[PDB]
Amino acid sequence: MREIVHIQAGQCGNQIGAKFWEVISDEHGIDPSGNYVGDSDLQLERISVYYNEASSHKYVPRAILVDLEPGTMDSVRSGAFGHLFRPDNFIFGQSGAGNNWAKGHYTEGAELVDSVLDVVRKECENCDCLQGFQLTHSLGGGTGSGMGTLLISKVREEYPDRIMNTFSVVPSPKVSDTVVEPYNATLSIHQLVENTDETYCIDNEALYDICFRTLKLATPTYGDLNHLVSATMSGVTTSLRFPGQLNADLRKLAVNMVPFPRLHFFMPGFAPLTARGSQQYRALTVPELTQQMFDAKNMMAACDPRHGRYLTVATVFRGRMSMKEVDEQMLAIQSKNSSYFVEWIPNNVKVAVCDIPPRGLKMSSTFIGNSTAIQELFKRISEQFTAMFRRKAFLHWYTGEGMDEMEFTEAESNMNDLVSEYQQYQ
Amino acid sequence: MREIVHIQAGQCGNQIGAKFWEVISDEHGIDPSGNYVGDSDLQLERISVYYNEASSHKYVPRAILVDLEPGTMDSVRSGAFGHLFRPDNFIFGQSGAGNNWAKGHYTEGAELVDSVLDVVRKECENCDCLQGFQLTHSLGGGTGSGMGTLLISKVREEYPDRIMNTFSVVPSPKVSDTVVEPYNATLSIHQLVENTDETYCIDNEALYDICFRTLKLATPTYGDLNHLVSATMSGVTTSLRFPGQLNADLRKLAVNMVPFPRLHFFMPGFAPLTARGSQQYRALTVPELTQQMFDAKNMMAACDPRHGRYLTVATVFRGRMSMKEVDEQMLAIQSKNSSYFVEWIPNNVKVAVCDIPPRGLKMSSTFIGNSTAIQELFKRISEQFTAMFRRKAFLHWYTGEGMDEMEFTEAESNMNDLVSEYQQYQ
Amino acid sequence: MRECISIHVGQAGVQIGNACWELYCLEHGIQPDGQMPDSFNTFFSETGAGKHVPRAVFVDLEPTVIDEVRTGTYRQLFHPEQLITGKEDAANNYARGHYTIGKEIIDLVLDRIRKLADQCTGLQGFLVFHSFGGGTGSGFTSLLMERLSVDYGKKSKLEFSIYPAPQVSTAVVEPYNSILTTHTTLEHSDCAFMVDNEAIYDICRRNLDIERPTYTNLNRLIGQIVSSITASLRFDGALNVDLTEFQTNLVPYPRIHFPLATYAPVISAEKAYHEQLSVAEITNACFEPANQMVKCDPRHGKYMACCLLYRGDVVPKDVNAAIATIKTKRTIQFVDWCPTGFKVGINYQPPTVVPGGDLAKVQRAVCMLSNTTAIAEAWARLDHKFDLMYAKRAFVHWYVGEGMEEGEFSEAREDMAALEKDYEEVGV
Amino acid sequence: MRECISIHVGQAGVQIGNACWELYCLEHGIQPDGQMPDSFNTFFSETGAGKHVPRAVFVDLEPTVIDEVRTGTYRQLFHPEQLITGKEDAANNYARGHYTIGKEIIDLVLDRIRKLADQCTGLQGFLVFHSFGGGTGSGFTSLLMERLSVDYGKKSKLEFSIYPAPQVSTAVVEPYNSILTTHTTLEHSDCAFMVDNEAIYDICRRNLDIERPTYTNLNRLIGQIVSSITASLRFDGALNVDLTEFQTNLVPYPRIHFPLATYAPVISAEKAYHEQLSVAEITNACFEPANQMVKCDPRHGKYMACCLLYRGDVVPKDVNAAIATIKTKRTIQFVDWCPTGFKVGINYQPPTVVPGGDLAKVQRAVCMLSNTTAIAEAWARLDHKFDLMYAKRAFVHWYVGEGMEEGEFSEAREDMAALEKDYEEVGV
Ligand SMILES: Nc1nc2c(ncn2[C@@H]2O[C@H](COP(=O)(O)CP(=O)(O)OP(=O)(O)O)[C@@H](O)[C@H]2O)c(=O)[nH]1
Ligand SMILES: Nc1nc2c(ncn2[C@@H]2O[C@H](COP(=O)(O)CP(=O)(O)OP(=O)(O)O)[C@@H](O)[C@H]2O)c(=O)[nH]1
Ligand SMILES: Nc1nc2c(ncn2[C@@H]2O[C@H](COP(=O)(O)OP(=O)(O)OP(=O)(O)O)[C@@H](O)[C@H]2O)c(=O)[nH]1
Ligand SMILES: Nc1nc2c(ncn2[C@@H]2O[C@H](COP(=O)(O)OP(=O)(O)OP(=O)(O)O)[C@@H](O)[C@H]2O)c(=O)[nH]1
Ligand SMILES: [Mg+2]
Ligand SMILES: [Mg+2]
Ligand SMILES: [Mg+2]
Ligand SMILES: [Mg+2]
């Protein structure tokens, strides 16, 4: 019951996804080549959510690994824990898109799609009850942005009522690892608008900041950053994988957190973000966690929630707690500074409490916010697009792959509309 | 009771046949020169289906080995396991047909036939109850195609009510190992049309594909390819050689799978096609097997079942299973995508379940389909014939051996008729 | 006296027999050799000093299945000449079963049958096991039935037919075989008890908690039904029932003798300790569509005749009250021309438990034989199936080549149609 | 006779049931297996030699919670088919509970219910546990209620609804779910006893001295209330009360059947030895707003009907005097059209103590069921909450996409308004 398909597209997705798999396997007591080292019946009970079980009690992720560039695939396999993945779920093209969204979306993506589709169908028919999909990818590159969205579209055509989740990394203004990010982001976000139920917006800059100032680390690697993301991912789905006191699946959160179909971009935050030298000077507790979760510093999306308003917030807590305590904390948060909580939605807080905490720490919280402040992120991107598009810069590459001016205009328009909608409700 | 005669004609037949013998001997615990190393009474019980038993408990195949070219015979004997064959069952001419069907069918075949006939009569009279015949051969060459069909005709004259089976390799368009394949195929298929009860159509291209993409092998040899064929052969007749829960002999399948006398060309498929590195990531089970069997990838004939319809399908499963499970799977297959199942035949699935699985794997399936998609195979051949015949190319050789234009015309006409019939019922 | 003889035809017939006879041996304290460590006389004869032997005959136009019998746990129970085999099977061809291949073996089996009859003193009847879809179970059975009619026109003949539902069909030509044989069956059978595999499977998953039923599993249940049927012949009761009774009480009209058997309670080892096993409860279970052994649409039709065979510890008063309650329920419908619908039979033997079995020991059990108009629907669907296939002459060559003529099929179809019409009529 | 059956719907329904049944087992000397080492007959049936089994049914459109039941301390108490699960939950969507997902499971549960009824002799009623804010506890419950109405229009049906106060809300769409379900509930429920989490929490901190209450903690208290309610059915008293009585005595008017239950005394192990536990004292405690299980503004309204269920050692005279005293107090107001406001019930059983519990053993206890006009305020606030959300069509897409139409909401709102008006009227 309630079984999920994972998908990883492009470089970022593949690496983040790997990390996620490492984490969740660790949580459920699974070794890399080793079949089972779990300590508890509970872990065993819901292995079938994310895994399949071959002969002699082996276990294997319902995960699909996709990229137009062969190299990253090589890296993934070459890592320790690489033997756990079914070899038939490695589905890569021959030549990479090279940060050309159009290539991702037309020339190579189309050629790639069929194999992917077949594998997804196979995965579906294998299992009794299909819940949802989880895609990890970028909006800044050609493959993750272009092909990913195509894939999503295809999926939608097949199963209209199933859940679509995406964990999407986003562009930031000061740090651009590609000059054509405005275009790439724009095109892909349009596509997302129509086919996703919930989208988790994640910024690298924010992550870096967190690593530097909160965790007090001088040398953050990508892996470290990815760790947080992995943790967040784990947190979201804890309700499906463990018996709690109050349980909230993917669907539940979606229903709770989306007042209008269009506005389904969630800003995740996480607690507690402790440092190594600094942890022994804290009393581990509900209120502290709650206080941490609503700081602008712990928003993984680089937007200030001070300049917008929360429509809705979902709080998923792990470890034993007093539900009453949690509720009182929530109340305190709401009444004290209701300045950033929308009046027409009376109670803006959703709570889920799951009994099994992550490995390492005794109590933890994941915060998922639908904030009107997210419009700010889109605005900068829009501005950048405008700046580029007026001079027709770099349009020629996109033209060369089938694209035409009209599409760009339309996507931008859509984005603008979205922005306006967010503003209106603020 | 229920005893069979095996025959191998031409190069392909001889090699495939050898492989088959190796397999079946292995299955029933027989060593190459060694009399008996079997582990079970069951094996012993039905040795007399395929074997004879000389003094001191020796065992010998009811197999006949035929070729116009002496060389292949030499190869067969020279191989390990070559001492098991009775020396009187090696019946070869002096000079090979050289891909001239007419030579195979008139000049040398006629000279060869009498000895073969005598040996077959000897084999028949020796045994209490004669069930059927199994011929392995090609349609692309002179001996397998021409002489084989003559032999078949002769057999028919003798015993009209006995079962005729043929395992016939077929030409493919991109890969032609002879330029005169259209002619050879045409002439032999005509002959088959009138005298065979069931014909198993097998393509090399398909086999190659399977070896490359499914088994993930870089260097397929002929032996490897032949292995699959051998396995298929073994699967067909498992009902005669073992006690099951549900049993289906040669006759049973024939009755079940041929709605009209003319349409007796079966497309075999097999499961599971596992790779060496890839096997440990599968839960061995009925549903998986069923899913594998109906993929276009696992059709040994290079035709797409997506562009035709199944008239009938026979499924032979080996190893312990839940019959109920199998039936439910079948139902699922039928109702879900009935798009390629003929309406006038209500239940298009035949099931046989035999308790003894092959050596190596724990559960396995053989699929035998009567698909209207087979017309496609004939069509290309017909086209090629038309292309050649208009310019009168290579006709002269055939003329030189007694043949005349009329025969060609007639065979082609027959083929066309056959094609039409398949279409009509689609 | 009152002895009864079992005939097993084709694979289905044999394997059912295997279970049944095993069950019987366990019931009467007969070890698999034949020694015991009277009542049982009706099924087992005696010869020698202490050895007991089944009055049974096994027929198959192929040695495969019966070879296993010859070399198994029960090899010593049967004398070798009560097992007849050796030849080519009727390859799912009714015609072969009836004409070509039936012809060669008939005399031998008939002689055996006669011998068995002669051994006994005034046996009541014959129990015939087979499938309708098999060439042997179809064609040969009819031939055998004919022979039996010829020899003993008077005596009772009951059958257990394995009937195919279209969704769980395992053979291509099931429709032809079923129709042809059914026509022949019609004139010479006193009643035929239909069993559907699908229903059995359903029962296994829901009420026995087994996801993967084998054929072996299925047969046990069937054997239990048989036991329930014939227990009144083999044992002392409070109120008794015989083979003659069934014919009398289930057949309003000559042609309408195809009733369904249901059984309860069907319980796993685990579920019993949380079970108040009531007489009323089991009766209730008996009339619930999920417990039917044929998938028939029971609520749409009406019930014509119903026989309830209880076994174990029972208070007749309680049974009566249960019956009354059932009658009082509105949705269950009896035909207006029969006010009183239940024949009731009681047996002091608790039903038995098979070593390594699926079924829990129970203290009260019931087998209901019930005749409903709804079963006509099954025939209608079969006829529909037949009609399309016939339309294109699909698979006709096989039958015509075996000495069967084409108009025969048409005749059979007509007969079936008439039968269907009859059910429609009597239900008014 | 007089048996009663418990139905547990959704997570809230299940977990409450868990505590309740545990409590019951402890009360009647039933170990967690099912053996005892009659009175209890009204809640437990018997089957087998010595094993006792709950007349209870657990329903959830998701396996999570009920899986724990299956594999816990009380795994052996329930037969597996009284636990129904397995599917996608109504994701806090009333519509899913009622239309899409309720449709698939209803028949199975209904059959079970019928079976349970049939096992018993003339059961009085049903006890239904659920939340209003859950998609299952809202949508499914209404559907179930409908079914029950259809089957047994006559019989009594009581419910325990977990009602949400706006300040301690844990779900976004609690207002929609509550309103829709409440309308449906209105026509088919005899009375619904509201419980507020916040109130419980308050009680725990003040009178049990626990700063950190878990859900597990809360449920114990609720179970005690239930026990108090049904003790008169299960035990010998001096003056008795039944389910029928409650309906009679609490409902002046068809639509006005939403009374509050309060309980006392609620004491830690420590505080008891400095406690003069008086009959009068507990009565007094009963009418003090800090002891209410719903936060309602009790002093502003008037009391319409009040049932006092005493258990333990009690002198009826003392109770009478206490009642008189209460009446004499000026601030507590009864409606002018009812002079005599208290139904009084007595039970010789001391309430029980749970191993590892929070509650002290007491010799006198009381559960008061009281109907006040003040509870209308709760509905008003809920309606206000609903009204703003509705205004922008917030979260409407989820409901419309599940086969629920938009005017329905409006209708529900109207109904609620009318209900509110009614309370205002009857209070004059
Ligand atoms: N959170 C992370 N973000 C990353 C990581 N690596 C890259 N990125 C971000 O992703 C952006 C580009 O994504 P990719 O590297 O996957 C390039 P993509 O495969 O999407 O298309 P091509 O460039 O055509 O291959 C880049 O601008 C970075 O901001 C990582 O390990 N973690
Ligand atoms: N499946 C296999 N097919 C083969 C094998 N060897 C050859 N062939 C196919 O058979 C075709 C010709 O068959 P043969 O080699 O037996 C030539 P044949 O003896 O039939 O007549 P002559 O050419 O007159 O000797 C050739 O075009 C190939 O496509 C084999 O080992 N396996
Ligand atoms: N209930 C039950 N049905 C069976 C069993 N074995 C086969 N069948 C059914 O019988 C039909 C197949 O025919 P068989 O009983 O094998 O017929 P046969 O008389 O042996 O003749 P052939 O099938 O031609 O060998 C199908 O409808 C099967 O579902 C069994 O053990 N139990
Ligand atoms: N008193 C009490 N209330 C509970 C408990 N668990 C959940 N609730 C309340 O129930 C509501 C949430 O609905 P659930 O009972 O989970 O509803 P459900 O029927 O399981 O359906 P979903 O919530 O959609 O899973 C909230 O108002 C909670 O405060 C419990 O153990 N005790
Ligand atoms: Mg890349
Ligand atoms: Mg050659
Ligand atoms: Mg058979
Ligand atoms: Mg729930």
Identical topology for domains B1-259 and B260-373: no
Sign of the C-alpha dihedral computed for residues B381, B386, B391 and B392 taken in this order: positive
**Alpha-carbon distance C201 to nearest alpha carbon in chain B (angstroms):** 7
In the residue annotation, C245 being an active-site residue is answered as yes
Scanning D344-405, the segments in alpha helix (DSSP H) are: 376-391, 396-400
CB distance B95 to B68 below 8 Å: yes
| Residue A222 Cβ < 6 Å to ligand 1 | yes
For β-strands D364-372 and D260-264, DSSP reports them as antiparallel
Q: Is the peptide bond before D265 cis (omega within 30 degrees of 0)?
A: yes
Residues 6+ apart with CB under 8 A from D305: D249, D250, D251, D252, D259, D338, D341, D343, D370, D371
CB distance C13 to C129 below 8 Å: yes
CA distance D101 to D82: 19
Catalytic residue among D68, D245, D281, D408: D245
CA distance A102 to A145: 9
The dihedral formed by the CA atoms of D115, D120, D124 and D129, expressed in degrees to the nearest 10: -50
- Strand residue runs (E) in B205-339: 244-246, 265-271, 310-318
For chain B, which residues make up each domain, given as ranges?
A: 1-259, 260-373, 374-426
3-state secondary structure of B165: strand
Q: Is D397 on the interface with A (CB under 8 A)?
A: yes
In a shared domain, residues D134 and D190: yes
3-state secondary structure of A161: coil
Residue A1 to residue D173, Cβ atoms within 8 A? no
3-state secondary structure of A392: coil
CA distance B109 to A323: 92
**Alpha-carbon distance D50 to nearest alpha carbon in chain C (angstroms):** 9
DSSP A370: E
User: C-alpha angle with apex D359: D354 to D365, nearest 5 degrees?
Assistant: 100
Q: Is B344 on the interface with A (CB under 8 A)?
A: no
- In the block, tokens 């369904």 appear at C260
Q: Is C13 on the interface with B (CB under 8 A)?
A: no
Q: For chain B, give me the number of helices (H) and strands (E)?
A: 17, 13
State the greatest distance between any 2 C-alpha atoms of chain B, in Å, as a whole number: 63
CA distance D428 to A161: 52
Of A54, A122, A125, the CB nearest to B281: A54
- In the block, tokens 């499906």 appear at A240
Residue D364 sits in a domain of what CATH number?
3.30.1330.20
Residue type, C282: I
CA distance B247 to B134: 19
CB distance A14 to A205 below 8 Å: no
**Alpha-carbon distance D48 to nearest alpha carbon in chain C (angstroms):** 6
Pull the structure tokens for residue B264: 């007796």
Chains C and A touch (3+ CB pairs under 8 A): no
Neighbouring subunits of B (3+ Cβ pairs under 8 A): A, C
In a shared domain, residues C316 and C338: yes
Name the domain count of chain D. Answer: 3
Q: Is A308 flagged in the annotation as binding?
A: no
CB distance C370 to C343 below 8 Å: no
CA distance D124 to D243: 7
Backbone angles phi, psi at D21, to 5 degrees: -65, -40
Beta bridge partners of B353: B246, B317
| Residue D97 Cβ < 6 Å to ligand 4 | no
Q: How far from A185 is each of A301, A403, A405, C63, C308, CA to CA, in Å? A: 15, 15, 16, 73, 75
Residue D383 sits in a domain of what CATH number?
1.10.287.600
Residue with the smallest CA separation from ligand 1 atom 29 is: A177
CA distance C231 to D205: 69
In a shared domain, residues C254 and C264: no
Residue type, A31: D
Residue type, B424: Q
Percent helix, strand and coil across chain B, each to the nearest 5: 50, 20, 30
H or E element, residue B365: strand B364-371
Q: How far from C231 is each of C1, C37, C155, D397, CA to CA, in Å? A: 15, 20, 20, 64
For β-strands B265-271 and B364-371, DSSP reports them as antiparallel
Pull the structure tokens for residue A123: 């995965």
CA distance C166 to C154: 36
In a shared domain, residues D163 and D100: yes
Give the environment of ion ligand 8: residues with CB less than 5 A. Answer: D 11
CB distance A380 to A338 below 8 Å: no
Q: How far from A142 is each of A6, A134, A153, CA to CA, in Å? A: 20, 19, 16
CA distance D304 to C111: 92
Per DSSP, the residues of A203-245 read EHHHHHHIIIIIS--S---HHHHHHHHHHHHHHHTHHHHS-EE
Burial class (CB in 10 A: 0-12, 13-18, 19+), D106: middle
In a shared domain, residues D422 and D358: no
Chains A and D touch (3+ CB pairs under 8 A): yes
For β-strands A265-271 and A364-371, DSSP reports them as antiparallel
For β-strands C125-131 and C4-9, DSSP reports them as parallel
CA distance D200 to D80: 33
Q: Among residues C243, C259, C275, which one ends one of the domains?
A: C259
* Closest CA relative to residue C265, chosen from C246, C284, C239: C284
CA distance B120 to B81: 23
Residues 6+ apart with CB under 8 A from D121: D1, D3
- In the block, tokens 């949508």 appear at D139
Ligand nearest to the backbone CA of B141: 2
| Residue D161 Cβ < 6 Å to ligand 4 | no
Pull the structure tokens for residue A380: 């900068």
Pull the structure tokens for residue D203: 């009680």
In a shared domain, residues C281 and C352: yes
Ligand nearest to the backbone CA of A11: 1
Burial class (CB in 10 A: 0-12, 13-18, 19+), B83: exposed
Q: How far from B172 is each of A57, B99, B217, CA to CA, in Å? A: 43, 16, 21
In a shared domain, residues C61 and C164: yes
Q: Among residues C259, C278, C297, which one ends one of the domains?
A: C259
Pull the structure tokens for residue C124: 């009541």
CA distance B376 to B363: 32
In a shared domain, residues C331 and C410: no
* Closest CA relative to residue B147, chosen from B112, B180, B177, B178: B112
Q: How far from B1 is each of A381, B63, C82, CA to CA, in Å? A: 82, 17, 19
**Alpha-carbon distance C214 to nearest alpha carbon in chain B (angstroms):** 5
Q: Which CATH code for domain B374-426? A: 1.10.287.600
H or E element, residue A76: helix A70-78
Residue C275 to residue D79, Cβ atoms within 8 A? yes
Contacts 24+ apart (CB under 8 A), A172-180: A172/A203, A172/A204, A172/A205, A172/A206, A172/A302, A173/A380, A173/A384, A174/A205, A175/A204, A175/A205, A177/A140, A178/A99, A178/A140, A178/A141, A179/A394, A180/A99, A180/A100, A180/A394
Ligand nearest to the backbone CA of C10: 3
Residue type, B132: G
* Closest CA relative to residue A423, chosen from A371, A384, A387, A382: A371
| Residue D167 Cβ < 6 Å to ligand 4 | no
H or E element, residue B420: helix B405-425
DSSP D274: G
For β-strands D4-9 and D56-59, DSSP reports them as parallel
Residues 6+ apart with CB under 8 A from A396: none
In a shared domain, residues D236 and D339: no
Task: Please give the number of the atom of ligand 3 that sits closest to the Cα of C222.
Answer: 1
- In the block, tokens 């402040």 appear at A373
Determine the residue among D81, D82, D120 to mutate to test chain C binding: the one whose Cβ has the most chain C Cβ atoms within 10 Å. Answer: D81
3-state secondary structure of B4: strand
Rounded distance from Cα A116 to ligand 1 centre (Å): 21
In a shared domain, residues D342 and D411: no
CA distance B102 to B187: 9
CA distance B301 to B206: 6
DSSP D287: T
Residue with the smallest CA separation from ligand 3 atom 23 is: C134
Count other Cβ atoms within 10 Å, centred on residue A153. 14
Per DSSP, the residues of B314-332 read EEEEESS--HHHHHHHHHH
Q: Is B360 on the interface with A (CB under 8 A)?
A: no
Residues 6+ apart with CB under 8 A from C200: C213, C218, C221, C222, C293
Contacts 24+ apart (CB under 8 A), B402-405: B402/B102, B402/B106, B402/B107, B403/B102, B403/B106
Q: How far from A381 is each of A32, A173, A176, C33, CA to CA, in Å? A: 41, 8, 12, 89
Pull the structure tokens for residue A290: 């709650």
| Residue B11 Cβ < 6 Å to ligand 2 | yes
Which of the listed CATH numbers 3.30.450.20, 3.40.50.1100, 3.40.50.1440, 1.10.3720.10 matches domain A1-259?
Answer: 3.40.50.1440
List residues of B whose CB lies inside 8 A of any C CB: 1-2, 41, 45, 129, 131, 243-247, 249, 251-252, 254-261, 312, 322-325, 327, 331, 343-351, 425
The dihedral formed by the CA atoms of A120, A121, A123 and A127, expressed in degrees to the nearest 10: 140
| Residue D137 Cβ < 6 Å to ligand 4 | yes
Residue C44 sits in a domain of what CATH number?
3.40.50.1440
Q: How many CB pairs under 8 A join C and D?
A: 28
Class of domain A260-373: alpha beta
Rounded distance from Cα B141 to ligand 2 centre (Å): 6
Q: Is the peptide bond before C265 cis (omega within 30 degrees of 0)?
A: yes
In a shared domain, residues D279 and D215: no
Of C167, C173, C214, the CB nearest to B322: C214
Catalytic residue among C46, C198, C245, C281: C245
Backbone angles phi, psi at B367, to 5 degrees: -120, 130
Scanning C127-190, the segments in alpha helix (DSSP H) are: 135, 141-151, 174-188
Q: Among residues C196, C229, C259, which one ends one of the domains?
A: C259
Q: Is the peptide bond before A272 cis (omega within 30 degrees of 0)?
A: yes
Pull the structure tokens for residue C328: 């009082």
Residue D19's domain comprises 1-259
Instruction: Order across the sheet with B244-246: list the strands.
Output: B90-92, B63-67, B3-9, B130-138, B163-170, B198-203, B265-271, B364-371, B310-318, B349-354, B244-246
In a shared domain, residues D325 and D276: yes
